[PDB]
Amino acid sequence: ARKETYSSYIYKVLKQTHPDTGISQKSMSILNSFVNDIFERIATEASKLAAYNKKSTISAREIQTAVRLILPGELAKHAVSEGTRAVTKYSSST
DNA sequence: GTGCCTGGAGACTAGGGAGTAATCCCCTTGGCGGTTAAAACGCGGGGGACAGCGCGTACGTGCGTTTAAGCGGTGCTAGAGCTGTCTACGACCAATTGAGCGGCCTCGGCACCGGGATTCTCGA
């Protein structure tokens, strides 16, 4: 039995950015609630936008428009930068 | 550090969406005149925004007192999972039917338009 969390990945990216910093468990649960909340926000907005575009699939175009909707524009263009980086580094399926 | 359980990774075969030909085609964007109700310039003002004073009171602050109330223990008590075991239980493709849309035709009070009766001016 387990509960799905992202404390290991948060600690990994935090030590990757700055290894000389720590984080307690209460703030870890707060950030886990935060990432589940924004995942719920983006997923429901993408489902709304897919149902509005007469298309019952989820591509990356709806996610791009959804992160252009709810995120601010500097974070929106940084998010499309990170997303294009993720697709271009994932497409090399060798 | 150490670790075993299990979601993660992934190729092959049916099987349903994507955007490129294609063509209507309706809505729109752009401009010319007019005319008109609304936008703009100005001018005297007076009524409402604003500074200041009178005051008194009620909260800023401090002190005796109670007053729950917090920290720590632990049994009492009764509410939250998990694996079996069985029952329902909502969907899949297909013939038949249906009931609300595409475009058509009929009423009906509101505003405009004319006569019957009444009132005003003159004539007979």
CA atoms within a 13 Å half-sphere pointing along the CA-CB vector of A78: 5
Q: Are A20 and A32 in contact (CB under 8 A)?
A: no
Task: Count other C-beta atoms under 10 Å from residue A47's C-beta.
Answer: 14
The reply to whether the CB atom of residue A92 sits less than 7 A from any atom in nucleic acid chain B is: no
Structure-token pair, residue A50: 């897919």
- Exposure string of A66-86, with b = 16+ CB inside 10 Å and e = fewer, is bbeeebeeeebeebbeeeeee
Task: Quickly list DSSP for A34-66.
Answer: HHHHHHHHHHHHHHHHHHHTT--S--HHHHHHH
CB A80 within 8 A of CB A72: no
Angle CA(A3)–CA(A14)–CA(A36) in degrees, nearest 5?
35
Hunting for tokens 């509960």 — which residue is that? A3
Q: Which two tokens stand for residue A5?
A: 């969390």
Residue type at A86 in one-letter notation = A
- Answer whether any strand B atom is within 7 A of the Cβ of A91: no
Q: Closest nt to A50 (CA→C1')?
A: B17
- Helices A25-52, A7-17: axis angle to 10 degrees equals 100
User: Using alpha carbons only, what angle is made at residue A61 by residues A58 and A64, rounded to the nearest 5 degrees?
Assistant: 110
Resolution in A: 4.2
Task: For residue A71, give the DSSP letter.
Answer: S
Contact between the CB of A56 and strand B at under 7 Å: yes
Q: Which residue bears the tokens 């699939």?
A: A57
